Motif scaffolding. Structure first.
Motif, PDB file in Angstrom:
ATOM      1  N   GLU A  20     -44.828  18.382 -15.534  1.00 12.73           N
ATOM      2  CA  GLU A  20     -44.424  16.992 -15.389  1.00 12.73           C
ATOM      3  C   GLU A  20     -44.555  16.270 -16.721  1.00 12.73           C
ATOM      4  O   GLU A  20     -45.551  16.431 -17.432  1.00 12.73           O
ATOM      5  CB  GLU A  20     -45.279  16.299 -14.332  1.00 12.73           C
ATOM      6  CG  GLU A  20     -44.716  16.373 -12.933  1.00 12.73           C
ATOM      7  CD  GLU A  20     -45.522  15.559 -11.946  1.00 12.73           C
ATOM      8  OE1 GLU A  20     -46.378  14.767 -12.386  1.00 12.73           O
ATOM      9  OE2 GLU A  20     -45.306  15.713 -10.728  1.00 12.73           O
ATOM     10  N   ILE A  21     -43.544  15.480 -17.063  1.00  8.74           N
ATOM     11  CA  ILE A  21     -43.525  14.723 -18.306  1.00  8.74           C
ATOM     12  C   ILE A  21     -43.053  13.311 -17.996  1.00  8.74           C
ATOM     13  O   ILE A  21     -42.019  13.128 -17.344  1.00  8.74           O
ATOM     14  CB  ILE A  21     -42.621  15.387 -19.360  1.00  8.74           C
ATOM     15  CG1 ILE A  21     -43.312  16.621 -19.937  1.00  8.74           C
ATOM     16  CG2 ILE A  21     -42.289  14.415 -20.470  1.00  8.74           C
ATOM     17  CD1 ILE A  21     -42.363  17.719 -20.328  1.00  8.74           C
ATOM     18  N   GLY A  22     -43.813  12.318 -18.455  1.00 10.59           N
ATOM     19  CA  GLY A  22     -43.469  10.927 -18.279  1.00 10.59           C
ATOM     20  C   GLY A  22     -42.970  10.315 -19.577  1.00 10.59           C
ATOM     21  O   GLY A  22     -43.020  10.919 -20.642  1.00 10.59           O
ATOM     22  N   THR A  23     -42.492   9.082 -19.465  1.00 12.42           N
ATOM     23  CA  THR A  23     -41.943   8.351 -20.595  1.00 12.42           C
ATOM     24  C   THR A  23     -42.662   7.020 -20.727  1.00 12.42           C
ATOM     25  O   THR A  23     -42.818   6.297 -19.740  1.00 12.42           O
ATOM     26  CB  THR A  23     -40.439   8.128 -20.423  1.00 12.42           C
ATOM     27  OG1 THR A  23     -39.797   9.383 -20.178  1.00 12.42           O
ATOM     28  CG2 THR A  23     -39.845   7.496 -21.665  1.00 12.42           C
ATOM     29  N   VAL A  24     -43.099   6.702 -21.943  1.00 14.03           N
ATOM     30  CA  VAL A  24     -43.711   5.407 -22.208  1.00 14.03           C
ATOM     31  C   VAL A  24     -42.643   4.333 -22.068  1.00 14.03           C
ATOM     32  O   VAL A  24     -41.593   4.397 -22.714  1.00 14.03           O
ATOM     33  CB  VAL A  24     -44.351   5.376 -23.601  1.00 14.03           C
ATOM     34  CG1 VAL A  24     -44.917   4.001 -23.897  1.00 14.03           C
ATOM     35  CG2 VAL A  24     -45.431   6.429 -23.710  1.00 14.03           C
ATOM     36  N   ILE A  25     -42.909   3.337 -21.227  1.00 12.52           N
ATOM     37  CA  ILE A  25     -41.933   2.290 -20.952  1.00 12.52           C
ATOM     38  C   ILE A  25     -42.335   1.003 -21.661  1.00 12.52           C
ATOM     39  O   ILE A  25     -41.476   0.217 -22.068  1.00 12.52           O
ATOM     40  CB  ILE A  25     -41.761   2.081 -19.438  1.00 12.52           C
ATOM     41  CG1 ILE A  25     -43.091   1.744 -18.769  1.00 12.52           C
ATOM     42  CG2 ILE A  25     -41.164   3.321 -18.808  1.00 12.52           C
ATOM     43  CD1 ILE A  25     -42.955   1.358 -17.319  1.00 12.52           C
ATOM     44  N   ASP A  26     -43.635   0.779 -21.828  1.00 12.22           N
ATOM     45  CA  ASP A  26     -44.106  -0.328 -22.646  1.00 12.22           C
ATOM     46  C   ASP A  26     -45.491   0.007 -23.175  1.00 12.22           C
ATOM     47  O   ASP A  26     -46.183   0.879 -22.649  1.00 12.22           O
ATOM     48  CB  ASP A  26     -44.128  -1.647 -21.868  1.00 12.22           C
ATOM     49  CG  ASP A  26     -44.932  -1.563 -20.596  1.00 12.22           C
ATOM     50  OD1 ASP A  26     -46.175  -1.645 -20.674  1.00 12.22           O
ATOM     51  OD2 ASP A  26     -44.325  -1.421 -19.517  1.00 12.22           O
ATOM     52  N   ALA A  27     -45.885  -0.697 -24.232  1.00  8.25           N
ATOM     53  CA  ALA A  27     -47.158  -0.447 -24.887  1.00  8.25           C
ATOM     54  C   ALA A  27     -47.612  -1.706 -25.604  1.00  8.25           C
ATOM     55  O   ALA A  27     -46.794  -2.459 -26.133  1.00  8.25           O
ATOM     56  CB  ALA A  27     -47.054   0.712 -25.882  1.00  8.25           C
ATOM     57  N   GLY A  28     -48.923  -1.921 -25.621  1.00  7.16           N
ATOM     58  CA  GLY A  28     -49.497  -3.049 -26.321  1.00  7.16           C
ATOM     59  C   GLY A  28     -50.972  -3.227 -26.038  1.00  7.16           C
ATOM     60  O   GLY A  28     -51.435  -2.956 -24.927  1.00  7.16           O
ATOM     61  N   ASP A  29     -51.724  -3.669 -27.045  1.00  2.00           N
ATOM     62  CA  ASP A  29     -53.137  -4.005 -26.889  1.00  2.00           C
ATOM     63  C   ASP A  29     -53.943  -2.837 -26.335  1.00  2.00           C
ATOM     64  O   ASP A  29     -54.898  -3.033 -25.582  1.00  2.00           O
ATOM     65  CB  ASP A  29     -53.316  -5.236 -25.996  1.00  2.00           C
ATOM     66  CG  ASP A  29     -52.409  -6.378 -26.391  1.00  2.00           C
ATOM     67  OD1 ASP A  29     -52.759  -7.116 -27.331  1.00  2.00           O
ATOM     68  OD2 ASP A  29     -51.344  -6.543 -25.763  1.00  2.00           O
ATOM     69  N   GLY A  30     -53.579  -1.615 -26.702  1.00  2.00           N
ATOM     70  CA  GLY A  30     -54.312  -0.460 -26.234  1.00  2.00           C
ATOM     71  C   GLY A  30     -54.029  -0.066 -24.807  1.00  2.00           C
ATOM     72  O   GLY A  30     -54.815   0.677 -24.216  1.00  2.00           O
ATOM     73  N   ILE A  31     -52.935  -0.550 -24.228  1.00  2.00           N
ATOM     74  CA  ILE A  31     -52.529  -0.190 -22.876  1.00  2.00           C
ATOM     75  C   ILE A  31     -51.074   0.246 -22.924  1.00  2.00           C
ATOM     76  O   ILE A  31     -50.234  -0.453 -23.498  1.00  2.00           O
ATOM     77  CB  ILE A  31     -52.706  -1.361 -21.892  1.00  2.00           C
ATOM     78  CG1 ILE A  31     -54.190  -1.637 -21.655  1.00  2.00           C
ATOM     79  CG2 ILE A  31     -52.002  -1.063 -20.583  1.00  2.00           C
ATOM     80  CD1 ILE A  31     -54.864  -0.646 -20.751  1.00  2.00           C
ATOM     81  N   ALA A  32     -50.776   1.388 -22.318  1.00  2.66           N
ATOM     82  CA  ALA A  32     -49.421   1.915 -22.291  1.00  2.66           C
ATOM     83  C   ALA A  32     -49.030   2.253 -20.862  1.00  2.66           C
ATOM     84  O   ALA A  32     -49.820   2.825 -20.114  1.00  2.66           O
ATOM     85  CB  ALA A  32     -49.292   3.155 -23.174  1.00  2.66           C
ATOM     86  N   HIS A  33     -47.807   1.907 -20.487  1.00  8.14           N
ATOM     87  CA  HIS A  33     -47.295   2.198 -19.158  1.00  8.14           C
ATOM     88  C   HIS A  33     -46.316   3.355 -19.247  1.00  8.14           C
ATOM     89  O   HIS A  33     -45.472   3.394 -20.146  1.00  8.14           O
ATOM     90  CB  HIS A  33     -46.634   0.963 -18.552  1.00  8.14           C
ATOM     91  CG  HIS A  33     -47.608  -0.114 -18.199  1.00  8.14           C
ATOM     92  ND1 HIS A  33     -47.970  -1.106 -19.082  1.00  8.14           N
ATOM     93  CD2 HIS A  33     -48.320  -0.337 -17.071  1.00  8.14           C
ATOM     94  CE1 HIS A  33     -48.853  -1.902 -18.509  1.00  8.14           C
ATOM     95  NE2 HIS A  33     -49.082  -1.457 -17.288  1.00  8.14           N
ATOM     96  N   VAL A  34     -46.448   4.307 -18.329  1.00 10.43           N
ATOM     97  CA  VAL A  34     -45.690   5.550 -18.364  1.00 10.43           C
ATOM     98  C   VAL A  34     -44.932   5.697 -17.056  1.00 10.43           C
ATOM     99  O   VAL A  34     -45.530   5.620 -15.979  1.00 10.43           O
ATOM    100  CB  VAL A  34     -46.612   6.760 -18.592  1.00 10.43           C
ATOM    101  CG1 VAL A  34     -45.797   8.023 -18.765  1.00 10.43           C
ATOM    102  CG2 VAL A  34     -47.505   6.524 -19.795  1.00 10.43           C
ATOM    103  N   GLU A  35     -43.628   5.924 -17.145  1.00 12.52           N
ATOM    104  CA  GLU A  35     -42.837   6.223 -15.964  1.00 12.52           C
ATOM    105  C   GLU A  35     -42.809   7.726 -15.730  1.00 12.52           C
ATOM    106  O   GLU A  35     -42.857   8.521 -16.671  1.00 12.52           O
ATOM    107  CB  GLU A  35     -41.410   5.693 -16.097  1.00 12.52           C
ATOM    108  CG  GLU A  35     -40.593   6.358 -17.185  1.00 12.52           C
ATOM    109  CD  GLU A  35     -39.210   5.756 -17.319  1.00 12.52           C
ATOM    110  OE1 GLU A  35     -38.902   4.802 -16.575  1.00 12.52           O
ATOM    111  OE2 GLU A  35     -38.425   6.243 -18.160  1.00 12.52           O
TER     112      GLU A  35
END
Lengths: 40, 50
Positions: A20-35
């Motif tokens: 399984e491989i996800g994609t970073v959708i947003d990032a900032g302030d040491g927090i990243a969201h992955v789909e």
């Protein structure tokens, strides 16, 4: 253009198409969201 | 052209009514082959070739 529940029979074949491989959708302030990564 | 317009309007209302299929069909993807396969399995015969 009446369509039965056959869409479920097809859409399921489409989601199942996709290690399984996800994609970073947003990032900032040491927090990243992955789909993706459904099983994480 | 009239048949094409009618078929396209029918497909648009189908997508609007069936939210999940449109959602699945709208996600951007590098390879569109799964999406094309999904369309063909769904409505290959219902609508015309164009």
């Amino acid at each position: 253009t009446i369509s039965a529940a056959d869409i479920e029979g097809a859409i399921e074949d489409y989601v199942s198409s996709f290690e399984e491989i996800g994609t970073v959708i947003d990032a900032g302030d040491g927090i990243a969201h992955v789909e993706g990564l459904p099983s994480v | 052209l009239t048949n094409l317009a009618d078929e396209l309007a029918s497909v648009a209302k189908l997508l609007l009514s069936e939210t999940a299929l449109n959602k699945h069909l709208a996600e951007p993807t590098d390879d569109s082959a799964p999406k094309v396969r999904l369309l063909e399995r769904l409505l290959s015969d219902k609508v015309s070739a164009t």
